[PDB]
Design a protein around this ligand. Structure first.
Ligand SMILES: O=C1Cc2cc(C3CCCCC3)ccc2N1
Ligand SMILES: O=C1Cc2cc(C3CCCCC3)ccc2N1
Lengths: 546, 546
């Protein structure tokens, strides 16, 4: 029975094969068939290419050796290479054209999800070309999804030598009959077949995957669209910044490029962005996913005033100062969405771009108490229930597992009646003691929120709602302003509190506003519809935030 | 007696004054004198400019209001503005041309160093222009050096209104007679003078500084060249990455731009880079100053093999993987310098550029034991003393304060005889019990190293020297390679162990190698000669690493 899957890189996990380019160059340049391929494999196990794949020499040392082999092969065949023939140019283009074979990666991810140990086994080189970052990015993206990456130039062994196969088996801690091996080179399949491994000659991906599902008994072809890559908390870079003597802010950090600061809502975590963090980093951004003040590993002071918008925004400005960031793009959800619109109004020089999920920008009414306003809309009653210190903490902290299982549900799965929460006496009065697991979350994801909220509970988080009067007074100073920096508003069709129609007048205050809209999406936008959130944010970041 | 110094931004801390540009534009365009200045101050306390400085409106909302005032002023004066007249263009250029007045900043730094509370008090705007980052960068660089930054648009008050002065006094917790106030606008000096504050009308910086030193009794003009900005550990962003189950790596992070990874030597800390971190971040780089494995907040496993070059390099590759960095520029010193040359040889795709301070690249001799080699040179004897587990730990951990005070000394201050350390019985046998403080370090800086080394001691650090045979075997695999990625070798004239002449043959293995050389510099390069280290690294980063 199989428990390990091994994939080659070129022609298997990455397409088109760099190898296929030598054949193409010959044809484009009307050179004799297999001339470039013959010069490439010249000297066999003693040749430049073998020394290169074993890590004896680097790619830049190999370029002149290949050019010389092309000369010898050319001389013998009584032909001539054109004046502008560049091995460097041919390979730069080939390596640059090679992209991940997404369906092969998805099959590898599915096998790993079902308990398989996965590995990449490749004949590769030490790339010291000025344009080496392109391939370094490709390897970074690919490798994260596998248990092992075995590279010939690092191990000093090459396919088809039998030793690399014995090395692979030892790395996998598996007998050859427990391993399926996919390669596009028949010669490289042989030794694995010889040991007793299941082998798949990969020509077209589709047939290889039919062969792969036939031998594993796991469906890999025609499967539903997969969820974006998520985060394992223990595999992230964790950052800590002291913004004032008693306040430290925690964040998770992934990627290089423009800083994208993610601001969660109530009662959440940096982990609410788990499906966006790998996607935004892969799209070319430096992601900073915050634990907002009162949450997770960030400080949670008890005082109500510590959570007014003015204080929260000032601390986020200090957070940037301490990291040496002149700006960040600010992306918020729910309470984080409210914070990001205020960051844009009061600190435009520090905000590269602003985006909000569900939370619209509504300017303070100077003629109405913020309290009067909340009372008018029956959907906002839960916020009045939150006013009295201790009441909501008691109910929310009673059983953490039940709290997050009852809250984190899709639009249909809703177990809570938010109509007269106060009169009913609580949020969970008609909710089961043991709520069923929503299709949006696993038991493990719930347990992460449970463990996070064990540190400070719900006081600091609830205090975000206990500054209605302070926030309103501060917001009134901005009544003559407009948001004129790049801005994105993302509405969710099925958010029954933060309804799409609440955002309808935003163009009066943000004239250049861009929009996104998500069908069949509830309040928990990021985990409800991860794929669409990522697609909307990536598209807007690439056009408006660089 | 004075204990507080207050500086204006425009025409005081930053030059040329943006105000002076309106006068210049009038002259360049042959417009009537004071036309642009008259349109700028139009309506006085009720005008657009006052609303802008109070934070009522943003700079982009103000641009059209200013254009209209220019039209009215123009009409009255029976003149005409040319077809291509752009307020936006004039201000974009003015703000962009405005740089920090370095001697004014240095005086402010000197006053703060001598116990003064310092503040910036400015009439400024909420900048929402597409080019706002330029000024955000300027404010970030300036503000870090002051106790307070008071901005009119944030406080809703403006100079010369008396309330902003009373606000300033309350922020400073100082009576007006304890405050010196520097401003380039006589009208804005008046209210501070009226309260009893010492005021300085700033025209030319030099005269203002003579007036400033006359009233403070502190020398500010003609003082020695100041040391670069250093790091306060508690004010940094601290990062933590788990690279394997029992290994976590700690780093300090500052700046945006290409990742620059700093690798210290033995027996050091991320803090050995304190004078480079703010400079490299200010030069446009994302600095990652490491605590190397065995040091500070990084894990320190006991096993010798955990510290061989192969393991250390692999973990640094994983460190990049976990942060989502396809590459970093690697800059090392002493043992970190050795690690960076090996990062370049074995992982060129992950290394954007490589630089070393003191440590040359010398290829392994396959015909000589690494032990034989070390013994041949009497300067390397201290490494033989380090071989036996426990001996050097006992001497180095005995009294931490004495250890760092004896080690961290300039070339002349040297208290250690490194000639036959073994025969003498130890490094500190002829060293005093209470060494004097070197001119390179304060008592506080020593105490930081003392507290850092209290966690894991010297075992993990000493283990870096206990893998001579493992390292040599691994290095021998690279004997056919060349370093062809951008590389910088920095020699230190007075390093008696890592002598400049040991680097003489490096061009045979790194043909495109760049060099730096530091006169009168010992082994502790970064703190011995901070200014010159920064100048050499910044110049090489801007030309070779982007
Ligand atoms: O459709 C929905 C469901 C929903 C739930 C909530 C919660 C957040 C946690 C505390 C109680 C209120 C807020 C908005 C919406 N919008
Ligand atoms: O000029 C010099 C002084 C000096 C001192 C050292 C130390 C480092 C700590 C452990 C003992 C050896 C190494 C090189 C040099 N080069």
């Amino acid at each position: 029975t199989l428990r390990a899957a091994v994939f080659d890189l070129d022609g298997v996990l990455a397409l088109p094969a760099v190898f296929g380019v030598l054949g193409r160059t010959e044809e484009a340049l009307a050179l004799p068939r297999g001339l470039l391929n013959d010069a490439f494999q010249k000297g066999g196990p003693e040749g430049a290419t073998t020394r290169l794949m074993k890590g004896e020499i680097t790619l830049s040392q190999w370029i002149p050796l290949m050019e010389e082999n092309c000369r010898k092969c050319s001389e013998t065949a009584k032909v001539c290479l054109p004046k502008n023939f560049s091995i460097k140019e041919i390979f730069d283009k080939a390596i640059s054209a090679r992209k991940i074979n997404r369906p092969m990666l998805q099959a590898a991810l599915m096998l790993r999800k079902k308990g398989f140990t996965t590995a990449i086994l490749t004949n590769t080189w030490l790339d010291d070309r000025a344009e080496r970052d392109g391939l370094a990015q490709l390897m970074c993206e690919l490798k994260m999804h596998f248990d092992f990456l075995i590279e010939s130039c690092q191990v000093g062994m090459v396919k088809p030598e039998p030793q690399i196969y014995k090395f692979l088996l030892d790395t996998l801690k598996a007998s050859p009959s427990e391993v399926v091996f996919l390669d596009d080179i028949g010669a490289n399949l042989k030794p694995a077949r010889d040991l007793g491994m299941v082998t798949i000659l990969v020509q077209d991906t589709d047939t290889a995957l039919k062969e792969l599902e036939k031998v594993t008994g796991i469906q890999l072809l025609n499967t539903p669209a997969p969820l974006p890559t998520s985060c394992n908390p223990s595999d992230m870079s964790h950052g800590y910044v002291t913004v004032k003597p008693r306040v430290r802010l925690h964040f998770v950090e992934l990627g290089s490029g423009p800083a994208v600061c993610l601001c969660h809502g109530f009662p959440e975590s940096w982990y609410s962005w788990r499906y966006q963090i790998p996607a935004l980093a892969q799209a070319g951004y430096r992601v900073l996913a915050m634990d907002m003040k009162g949450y997770g590993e960030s400080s949670a002071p008890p005082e109500i005033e510590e959570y007014c918008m003015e204080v929260l925004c000032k601390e986020m400005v200090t957070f940037l100062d301490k990291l040496g960031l002149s700006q960040a793009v600010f992306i918020g959800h729910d309470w984080g969405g409210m914070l990001v619109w205020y960051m844009a109004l009061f600190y435009p020089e520090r905000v590269r771009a602003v985006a909000s999920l569900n939370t619209p920008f509504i300017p303070a009414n100077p003629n109405m108490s913020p309290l009067e306003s909340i009372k008018a809309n029956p959907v906002f009653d839960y916020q009045l229930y939150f006013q009295e210190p201790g009441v909501a903490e008691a109910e929310l902290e009673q059983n953490l597992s039940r709290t997050f299982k009852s809250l984190f549900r899709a639009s249909d799965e809703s177990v809570l009646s938010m109509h007269k929460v106060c009169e009913a006496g609580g949020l969970f009065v008609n909710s089961p003691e043991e709520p069923s697991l929503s299709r949006m979350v696993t038991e493990e994801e719930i347990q992460f929120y449970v463990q996070q909220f064990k540190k400070s509970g719900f006081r600091g988080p609830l205090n975000w709602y206990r500054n209605m009067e302070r926030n309103w007074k501060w917001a009134c100073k901005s009544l003559g302003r407009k948001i004129l920096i790049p801005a994105l508003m993302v509405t969710a069709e099925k958010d029954f509190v933060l309804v799409p129609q609440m955002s309808q007048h935003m163009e009066d205050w943000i004239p250049h506003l861009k929009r996104g809209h998500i069908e069949d999406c509830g309040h928990w936008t990021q985990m409800d519809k991860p794929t669409e959130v990522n697609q909307i944010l990536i598209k807007w970041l690439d056009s408006d935030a660089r």
